Amino acid sequence: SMSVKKPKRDDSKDLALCSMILTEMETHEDAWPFLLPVNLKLVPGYKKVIKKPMDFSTIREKLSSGQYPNLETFALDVRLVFDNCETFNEDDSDIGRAGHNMRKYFEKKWTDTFK
Protein backbone atom coordinates (compact mmCIF):
# COMPACT_ATOMS: atom_id res chain seq x y z
CA SER A 1 0.00 0.00 0.00
CA MET A 2 1.18 3.67 0.29
CA SER A 3 4.80 3.77 1.68
CA VAL A 4 4.58 -0.07 2.16
CA LYS A 5 6.48 -2.08 -0.40
CA LYS A 6 7.75 -5.63 -0.76
CA PRO A 7 11.52 -5.79 -1.33
CA LYS A 8 12.50 -4.61 -4.90
CA ARG A 9 13.06 -7.60 -7.30
CA ASP A 10 15.85 -6.75 -9.79
CA ASP A 11 14.07 -6.41 -13.14
CA SER A 12 17.02 -4.76 -15.00
CA LYS A 13 17.92 -7.92 -16.98
CA ASP A 14 14.33 -8.91 -17.90
CA LEU A 15 14.48 -7.24 -21.36
CA ALA A 16 17.65 -9.04 -22.30
CA LEU A 17 16.48 -12.32 -20.88
CA CYS A 18 13.03 -12.21 -22.70
CA SER A 19 15.07 -11.50 -25.92
CA MET A 20 17.14 -14.59 -25.36
CA ILE A 21 14.13 -16.78 -24.72
CA LEU A 22 12.46 -15.39 -27.84
CA THR A 23 15.70 -16.13 -29.84
CA GLU A 24 15.51 -19.70 -28.66
CA MET A 25 11.84 -19.94 -29.66
CA GLU A 26 12.66 -18.39 -33.10
CA THR A 27 15.36 -20.96 -33.76
CA HIS A 28 13.44 -24.07 -32.65
CA GLU A 29 12.74 -26.37 -35.57
CA ASP A 30 8.97 -26.35 -34.80
CA ALA A 31 8.74 -22.53 -34.84
CA TRP A 32 7.75 -22.32 -38.55
CA PRO A 33 3.97 -21.96 -38.00
CA PHE A 34 4.63 -19.01 -35.63
CA LEU A 35 7.46 -16.97 -37.23
CA LEU A 36 5.26 -14.56 -39.17
CA PRO A 37 1.75 -13.23 -38.99
CA VAL A 38 -0.93 -15.57 -40.38
CA ASN A 39 -1.84 -14.15 -43.81
CA LEU A 40 -5.40 -12.89 -43.24
CA LYS A 41 -6.09 -12.57 -46.97
CA LEU A 42 -5.12 -16.18 -47.66
CA VAL A 43 -6.40 -18.16 -44.66
CA PRO A 44 -10.17 -18.39 -44.65
CA GLY A 45 -11.79 -17.92 -41.29
CA TYR A 46 -8.70 -16.60 -39.43
CA LYS A 47 -9.55 -12.95 -39.42
CA LYS A 48 -13.06 -13.51 -37.99
CA VAL A 49 -12.24 -16.27 -35.59
CA ILE A 50 -8.92 -15.13 -34.02
CA LYS A 51 -9.65 -11.90 -32.39
CA LYS A 52 -6.02 -11.13 -31.47
CA PRO A 53 -3.48 -12.60 -33.89
CA MET A 54 0.06 -12.86 -32.50
CA ASP A 55 3.31 -14.28 -33.86
CA PHE A 56 7.05 -14.33 -32.96
CA SER A 57 8.02 -11.52 -35.38
CA THR A 58 5.30 -9.23 -33.92
CA ILE A 59 6.51 -10.06 -30.39
CA ARG A 60 10.10 -9.32 -31.48
CA GLU A 61 9.09 -5.91 -32.85
CA LYS A 62 7.05 -5.09 -29.72
CA LEU A 63 9.98 -6.16 -27.52
CA SER A 64 12.58 -4.17 -29.46
CA SER A 65 10.46 -1.00 -29.37
CA GLY A 66 9.56 -0.91 -25.65
CA GLN A 67 6.01 -1.98 -26.02
CA TYR A 68 6.11 -4.55 -23.20
CA PRO A 69 5.72 -2.79 -19.85
CA ASN A 70 6.90 -5.86 -17.94
CA LEU A 71 7.84 -9.53 -18.31
CA GLU A 72 4.21 -10.70 -17.68
CA THR A 73 2.85 -8.80 -20.69
CA PHE A 74 5.60 -10.53 -22.78
CA ALA A 75 4.51 -14.02 -21.51
CA LEU A 76 0.88 -13.21 -22.25
CA ASP A 77 1.73 -12.53 -25.98
CA VAL A 78 3.84 -15.71 -26.28
CA ARG A 79 0.94 -17.74 -24.71
CA LEU A 80 -1.52 -15.99 -27.05
CA VAL A 81 0.43 -17.41 -30.01
CA PHE A 82 -0.23 -20.92 -28.64
CA ASP A 83 -3.82 -20.33 -27.59
CA ASN A 84 -4.52 -19.03 -31.05
CA CYS A 85 -2.91 -22.12 -32.50
CA GLU A 86 -5.11 -24.42 -30.38
CA THR A 87 -8.22 -22.47 -31.35
CA PHE A 88 -7.62 -22.95 -35.08
CA ASN A 89 -5.75 -26.24 -35.46
CA GLU A 90 -6.65 -29.78 -34.61
CA ASP A 91 -4.33 -31.38 -31.98
CA ASP A 92 -3.65 -34.18 -34.49
CA SER A 93 -2.01 -31.97 -37.16
CA ASP A 94 1.55 -30.90 -37.73
CA ILE A 95 0.72 -27.32 -36.69
CA GLY A 96 -1.37 -28.48 -33.70
CA ARG A 97 1.56 -30.60 -32.45
CA ALA A 98 4.05 -27.79 -33.17
CA GLY A 99 1.96 -25.54 -30.89
CA HIS A 100 1.95 -27.96 -28.05
CA ASN A 101 5.68 -28.56 -28.37
CA MET A 102 6.51 -24.84 -28.50
CA ARG A 103 4.35 -24.02 -25.48
CA LYS A 104 6.12 -26.71 -23.45
CA TYR A 105 9.49 -25.46 -24.58
CA PHE A 106 8.54 -21.87 -23.69
CA GLU A 107 7.10 -22.68 -20.24
CA LYS A 108 10.24 -24.55 -19.17
CA LYS A 109 12.54 -21.73 -20.29
CA TRP A 110 10.25 -19.28 -18.51
CA THR A 111 10.32 -21.17 -15.17
CA ASP A 112 14.04 -21.80 -15.38
CA THR A 113 14.92 -18.21 -16.25
CA PHE A 114 12.63 -16.43 -13.79
CA LYS A 115 11.06 -18.86 -11.13
UniProtKB/Swiss-Prot annotation:
Limits of the Bromo domain: 9-113
Disulphide-bonded residues: none
Summary of the tissues where the protein is detected: Expressed at varying levels in several tissues, whereas a smaller transcript was expressed specifically in testis.
Localization annotation: Nucleus
Function noted in UniProt: Regulatory subunit of the ATP-dependent BRF-1 and BRF-5 ISWI chromatin remodeling complexes, which form ordered nucleosome arrays on chromatin and facilitate access to DNA during DNA-templated processes such as DNA replication, transcription, and repair. Both complexes regulate the spacing of nucleosomes along the chromatin and have the ability to slide mononucleosomes to the center of a DNA template. The BRF-1 ISWI chromatin remodeling complex has a lower ATP hydrolysis rate than the BRF-5 ISWI chromatin remodeling complex.
Assembly description: Component of the BRF-1 ISWI chromatin remodeling complex, at least composed of SMARCA1 and BAZ2B, which regulates the spacing of histone octamers on the DNA template to facilitate access to DNA. Within the BRF-1 ISWI chromatin remodeling complex interacts with SMARCA1; the interaction is direct. Component of the BRF-5 ISWI chromatin remodeling complex, at least composed of SMARCA5/SNF2H and BAZ2B, which regulates the spacing of histone octamers on the DNA template to facilitate access to DNA.
Family the UniProt entry places it in: Belongs to the WAL family.
Protein name stated in the entry: Bromodomain adjacent to zinc finger domain protein 2B
Organism for this UniProt entry: Homo sapiens (Human)
